Design a protein around this ligand. Structure first.
Ligand SMILES: CCCCCCCCCCCCCC(=O)OC[C@H](COP(=O)([O-])OCC[N+](C)(C)C)OC(=O)CCCCCCCCCCCCC
Ligand SMILES: CCCCCCCCCCCCCC(=O)OC[C@H](COP(=O)([O-])OCC[N+](C)(C)C)OC(=O)CCCCCCCCCCCCC
Ligand SMILES: CCCCCCCCCCCCCC(=O)OC[C@H](COP(=O)([O-])OCC[N+](C)(C)C)OC(=O)CCCCCCCCCCCCC
Ligand SMILES: CCCCCCCCCCCCCC(=O)OC[C@H](COP(=O)([O-])OCC[N+](C)(C)C)OC(=O)CCCCCCCCCCCCC
Ligand SMILES: CCCCCCCCCCCCCC(=O)OC[C@H](COP(=O)([O-])OCC[N+](C)(C)C)OC(=O)CCCCCCCCCCCCC
Ligand SMILES: CCCCCCCCCCCCCC(=O)OC[C@H](COP(=O)([O-])OCC[N+](C)(C)C)OC(=O)CCCCCCCCCCCCC
Ligand SMILES: CCCCCCCCCCCCCC(=O)OC[C@H](COP(=O)([O-])OCC[N+](C)(C)C)OC(=O)CCCCCCCCCCCCC
Ligand SMILES: CCCCCCCCCCCCCC(=O)OC[C@H](COP(=O)([O-])OCC[N+](C)(C)C)OC(=O)CCCCCCCCCCCCC
Ligand SMILES: C[C@H](CCC(=O)NCCC[N+](C)(C)CCCS(=O)(=O)[O-])[C@H]1CC[C@H]2[C@@H]3[C@H](O)C[C@@H]4C[C@H](O)CC[C@]4(C)[C@H]3C[C@H](O)[C@]12C
Ligand SMILES: C[C@H](CCC(=O)NCCC[N+](C)(C)CCCS(=O)(=O)[O-])[C@H]1CC[C@H]2[C@@H]3[C@H](O)C[C@@H]4C[C@H](O)CC[C@]4(C)[C@H]3C[C@H](O)[C@]12C
Ligand SMILES: C[C@H](CCC(=O)NCCC[N+](C)(C)CCCS(=O)(=O)[O-])[C@H]1CC[C@H]2[C@@H]3[C@H](O)C[C@@H]4C[C@H](O)CC[C@]4(C)[C@H]3C[C@H](O)[C@]12C
Ligand SMILES: C[C@H](CCC(=O)NCCC[N+](C)(C)CCCS(=O)(=O)[O-])[C@H]1CC[C@H]2[C@@H]3[C@H](O)C[C@@H]4C[C@H](O)CC[C@]4(C)[C@H]3C[C@H](O)[C@]12C
Ligand SMILES: C[C@H](CCC(=O)NCCC[N+](C)(C)CCCS(=O)(=O)[O-])[C@H]1CC[C@H]2[C@@H]3[C@H](O)C[C@@H]4C[C@H](O)CC[C@]4(C)[C@H]3C[C@H](O)[C@]12C
Ligand SMILES: C[C@H](CCC(=O)NCCC[N+](C)(C)CCCS(=O)(=O)[O-])[C@H]1CC[C@H]2[C@@H]3[C@H](O)C[C@@H]4C[C@H](O)CC[C@]4(C)[C@H]3C[C@H](O)[C@]12C
Ligand SMILES: [Ca+2]
Ligand SMILES: [Ca+2]
Ligand SMILES: [Ca+2]
Lengths: 267, 267, 267, 267
């Protein structure tokens, strides 16, 4: 069975077929957005849906047989797995968010197209080196969220009532979103020094952001420089090695000229 | 006989005449916004617009005569054509929006001045490399527009009731424009976890934008370095040949002292 | 006589004195904003002002004596002149504006501290290359402001009633300042397709800005690379001269014996 | 007593222990944000807070006997010192700002974890270089703050009534926060030319921000290219001397080919 399966799964027809289904299913999901469309064609697309997820379920199964344990070490396959699994949770449930979580299957367009994987992968590649700064930042947010909650939560429960609330508001302030007329001018009417809290906050988060970006650019180009430097330097020291080695064969060719005469009379 | 007219079209005087017209018609169109001006002088100015529109139409004709098919595969000319043709439809119609489009004709200043031409050209040229990421992003908006229509379009039809609406709203949020007090805080009064939707959306969308720019700057530098790697490397292996050929003149000079120095040593 | 003055004006005491007067003047001008401070013992300050204005006028005359015609080819000195100038015109009634323009004379601390002068200078030096992109963007605003007045000014005269008002509003939008809930959502309630105007506008205007920053950085690095690839090439061709010169005479240690041993055959 | 104490504070056990106490205290401090929690667990965590403060204090004392004079010239230990000191001030007072400042001691996670220090340290090194730009900007605000107060203060005391208030409003305008519908448009209802003040303000503060960033980037790369140039020119430095040492050595062995020619002269 294996090779018979393996050769259908690995084919140029298979993945092409899936992509095509994904794109159709994606057009189909936009149409289900229009209740007008749904009362006039909804039955056609409610099962187009149901059989596409059938095909994807089958595809997922075959691919597991064809790849066995190496399937679940694949980030992309793992995603396909979970994003399909989700659509298998019953279309009528107590948790009804999962029905909307079904739309994530359109991200298989990313999974199955290598230009897209390329993009995404490039994007992800910058993150591991940011985690420490992510960390420093989250710790910064958390300390200030605690302070803001103790300082402002009593009189301003909506914005600062709760740590989670102060977290939310501090993010808002970070995005510079209606932070003065909308948040701290109102705070200052009760707490005139509130600006000594939020303006340093704004300096720090903005400083950290910019410099992260700056640091990325500059450190990338410092590696590009090093890699270029060695090339130039290898070429300089294989080419100036010859001019050194060629003159030595002349410094030598004259000392052997010299001896030829050093054994002239002698005898 | 192309050539009789062809020398007129290619002349310094034809182009400068048109640029002079554009800048004049452009001054004209401004004053046409003043309602008081259109009393005291509206008739003079409608005249000028009709004159200019004629002149422009002729110049396009000549230019098609001179350039023939090469005219309709030149984007600059295509734009001049589509912007002049538009400007020729009757000022009173069913869709009178075209009356407003004829101000686009002022962009011929860009089109006719090579300095400007080159700016616009430089700007356009980052786009083809980007088309993939623009596609990722559009797909991203689209998936999120659908989810957002479903999650919030019932209670918030103005912001999310229709897919286009969710799109519009999602763009506003990307620009960070009044996104918390104006959209998300309202949403959370009905849907307390709505921050689980918009804050990741903001993270992804900002992250992509920043990394696109970063990736442009770093990779531009990379090729700036590749070619200066090759200029330097080509010169150290050129200079070596300059030392080399005036060292092959110390080769013959001692292989000729090689042939004849034991000859000088006779008995 | 000229030198006796010149040696005063050029001394580290003249400049220290003026800088000192500038900081004091700048401290009192802040104090003058307080009406408390102003009524009780604020007549002291009004005369201090007139003492400083004369001293600066003296400073300027002397400086014109010392530097003569080259004074007025100095942008820093010109700035100094005109800034002290407007502070000389009397507190003419109904010219209330010039009273506050006087404050512009604290920009002399910039004019007079070499460190300040250098940042400012560096900042100015970015501009001459940009004047094309500036022109392009200005024209772009003009075309859009004309279209906007025409499309939106009868129904939204505060925002768009006038070319001027339209420029102002398009600038607000460019800064993404309350652009959607505050301008475009209201517009769309009369004109549902208004998003076809502002969203493209926002794309172009933001695209042009990012790329202007991008192209500055990158083209700077190109120039930075052009310089370092020159120094390398010049230090490579550097000793190539005196190496090829010292071994064409090392070819002449052998070239002589064309006659030193061949004439020995002629005994 | 020393080494024994020294073997304690230098141990991997010591640091790990107090890092765990930081993280633990960090969690309990989040919990103290809850009124529910504080009610039925408060005395449990108010003690833990007292416990931790003592331990950090003995820790600070020990680290001092081990490091002594060096300790007080260590910025991280100075920080450590001072946020522990703050927590050592008694809560009972009129000034209860200090009870909130206690949670600053959680920044000790920054001082205690080397990848943290490294990032904070990287961030800081940016600052001394840009202090001159900061002085320029602060000056610019001050001058404009003064003009603002005198121009708009009487009619708009909330935003401009006072030097300090204008500073605040001008900072809001610089972050582009609700600057037009929120501040400048209202102002233009009384003062139609107010845009002649705020749009230049926006242009300058934006320009300077962007350019500062562009400057850090371009100048960091200028420096990288200098190190790179030297290292490369250093290579051309070593190698174009050892080919002139092989020349002198070629001459020193060719100055044997005029006195060993002295073996001719026989016939
Ligand atoms: C340099 C890169 C930037 C890093 C900056 C990260 C700093 C934090 C940014 C995110 C802030 C928003 C957090 C969230 O908006 O807060 C809400 C959450 C629960 O609060 P809630 O349900 O009571 O209120 C919710 C609203 N309601 C009152 C109506 C129910 O609070 C929770 O602590 C959220 C804890 C935040 C964890 C952050 C994860 C790191 C992301 C890296 C990927
Ligand atoms: C100094 C370094 C130490 C590291 C700190 C680790 C963080 C541990 C989490 C803290 C738990 C506090 C729970 C909160 O106190 O619950 C109160 C509140 C409901 O309050 P209630 O009692 O009135 O409800 C009736 O729930 C909240 O709003 C929603 C919960 C918000 C989650 C907080 C996000 C923490 C982000 C970790 C980043 C750490 C730095 C790397
Ligand atoms: C890189 C950036 C990533 C892409 C950014 C996407 C931003 C999309 C703009 C959203 C557009 O403003 O949404 C409106 C449009 C029609 O919706 P509506 O007629 O209900 O107008 C609603 C208004 N009203 C109810 C008063 C009639 O939605 C349209 O059909 C949806 C099509 C959106 C364009 C798809 C490709 C754009 C990529 C640019 C390159
Ligand atoms: C995963 C693979 C996806 C494949 C590409 C997806 C493109 C399919 C477009 C689907 C059309 C849905 C039209 C919408 O369902 O009509 C809803 C609404 C009419 O409402 P009503 O019928 O109740 O009126 C009484 O009008 C609407 O908002 C008008 C605007 C509709 C917005 C279309 C934007 C699509 C751009 C995404 C391209 C992706 C690039 C890779
Ligand atoms: C990269 C940089 C991009 C540069 C593009 C920026 C253009 C300037 C935007 C601001 C326009 C200005 O805020 O609008 C005001 C002014 C007319 O004021 P108003 O009396 O009509 O009403 C004012 C409102 N009120 C009715 C309440 C009294 O409009 C004037 O035409 C302004 C003309 C535009 C300024 C030209 C400067 C550049 C010159 C070429 C190089
Ligand atoms: C292809 C085009 C290139 C040629 C560029 C030429 C620009 C010169 C155009 C001058 C027309 C002024 C418009 C008019 O004067 O408008 C009158 C308006 C209302 O006055 P009203 O009482 O008659 O109301 C009823 O008042 C205004 O809004 C008050 C101030 C508005 C001044 C706008 C000047 C901006 C021009 C810079 C463009 C640079 C392009 C490179
Ligand atoms: C690179 C970017 C550098 C840009 C730096 C520009 C300066 C940022 C502006 C700070 C604005 C905060 C404001 O200024 O706060 C007001 C403060 C005291 O005034 P107030 O008590 O009336 O509070 C008014 C509030 N209420 C009356 C309702 C209670 O005004 C005082 O002049 C504070 C003067 C601020 C000194 C600025 C230090 C900058 C150095 C950073 C390193
Ligand atoms: C060229 C000049 C350079 C030297 C300038 C150095 C700064 C001199 C400080 C002047 C203080 C004026 C305070 C103001 O006159 O008091 C008004 C107000 C209370 O007024 P009241 O009397 O009606 O209360 C009953 O309180 C105010 O808002 C409190 C805020 C005070 C603002 C502090 C500004 C410092 C920024 C330094 C610039 C750095 C340059 C490199
Ligand atoms: C810890 C740093 C950020 C901290 C910071 O803010 N650093 C100061 C920067 C330079 N300054 C301009 C201040 C110059 C000062 C003097 S200098 O002589 O440089 O001019 C981290 C955060 C994310 C990291 C990078 C990314 O993961 C991606 C990338 C992966 C590659 O594996 C190699 C590098 C690279 C570029 C990473 C570099 C660096 O690991 C980064 C910037
Ligand atoms: C517009 C410019 C400049 C000069 C020019 O070509 N002006 C045409 C006038 C018509 N004439 C009758 C005078 C010549 C007819 C025959 S002739 O083929 O010898 O042109 C002409 C120069 C040579 C032309 C291209 C190339 O050829 C190659 C290429 C052929 C393809 O098809 C399509 C495109 C393409 C890129 C051409 C485009 C363009 O059109 C070009 C750029
Ligand atoms: C798809 C990529 C962008 C995706 C991305 O995010 N890419 C790299 C990550 C960079 N990081 C520093 C994060 C990785 C760390 C390791 S690294 O070794 O970078 O230090 C695309 C987007 C736009 C593209 C360019 C532009 O059209 C312009 C330009 C045209 C020229 O014809 C030559 C290339 C160039 C520079 C294009 C290169 C590249 O086609 C780009 C960046
Ligand atoms: C060239 C541009 C305008 C034209 C343009 O819009 N250029 C876009 C390049 C797009 N990309 C970078 C993607 C190309 C990558 C493909 S490529 O194959 O390059 O990798 C102009 C506008 C502003 C100018 C600079 C500034 O005055 C400052 C500065 C002054 C100095 O006097 C010298 C340089 C410098 C850096 C100026 C250089 C440049 O004159 C600039 C960038
Ligand atoms: C550490 C160095 C020198 C190295 C050393 O070793 N110093 C003595 C400790 C010796 N041991 C640890 C070997 C003994 C424990 C024996 S055991 O059987 O317990 O392991 C010496 C140099 C300077 C000395 C101190 C100062 O003058 C003054 C100072 C006053 C204080 O108010 C009390 C003591 C104190 C701290 C002094 C302690 C110690 O003198 C110091 C730190
Ligand atoms: C005062 C200057 C800012 C001046 C400015 O605003 N702009 C320069 C013009 C850039 N342009 C491209 C326009 C030049 C055009 C021609 S050019 O072709 O020469 O590029 C200051 C502000 C911040 C300073 C740096 C940082 O502390 C970090 C860093 C520390 C390191 O210890 C060494 C360098 C470095 C990069 C510092 C360099 C520089 O001391 C900076 C940029
Ligand atoms: Ca905003
Ligand atoms: Ca380089
Ligand atoms: Ca707003």
């Amino acid at each position: 069975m294996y090779l018979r399966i393996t050769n259908i799964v690995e084919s140029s027809f298979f993945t092409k077929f899936i992509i095509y289904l994904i794109v159709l299913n994606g057009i189909t999901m936009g149409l289900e957005t229009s209740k007008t469309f749904m009362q006039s064609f909804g039955v056609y697309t409610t099962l187009f849906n149901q059989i596409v997820i059938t095909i994807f379920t089958i595809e997922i199964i075959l691919r597991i047989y064809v790849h066995r344990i190496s399937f679940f070490k694949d980030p992309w396959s793992l995603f396909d797995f979970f994003v399909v699994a989700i659509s298998l949770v019953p279309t009528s449930s107590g948790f009804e968010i999962l029905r909307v979580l079904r739309v994530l299957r359109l991200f298989r367009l990313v999974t199955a197209v290598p230009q897209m994987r390329k993009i995404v992968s490039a994007l992800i590649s910058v993150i591991p080196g940011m985690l420490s700064v992510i960390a420093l930042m989250t710790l910064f947010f958390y300390i200030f969220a605690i302070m803001a909650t103790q300082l402002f939560g009593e009189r301003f429960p909506e914005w600062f009532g709760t740590l989670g609330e102060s977290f939310y508001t501090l993010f808002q302030v970070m995005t510079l979103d209606d932070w003065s007329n909308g948040i701290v001018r109102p705070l200052m009417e009760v707490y005139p020094y509130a600006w000594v809290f939020f303006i340093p906050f704004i300096f720090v988060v903005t400083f950290v952001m910019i410099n992260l970006v700056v640091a990325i650019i500059v450190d990338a180009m410092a590696i590009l420089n090093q890699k270029e430097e060695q090339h130039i330097i290898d070429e300089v020291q294989s080419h100036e090695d010859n001019i050194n080695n060629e003159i030595i064969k002349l410094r030598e060719e004259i000392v052997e000229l010299k001896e030829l005469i050093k054994t002239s009379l002698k005898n």
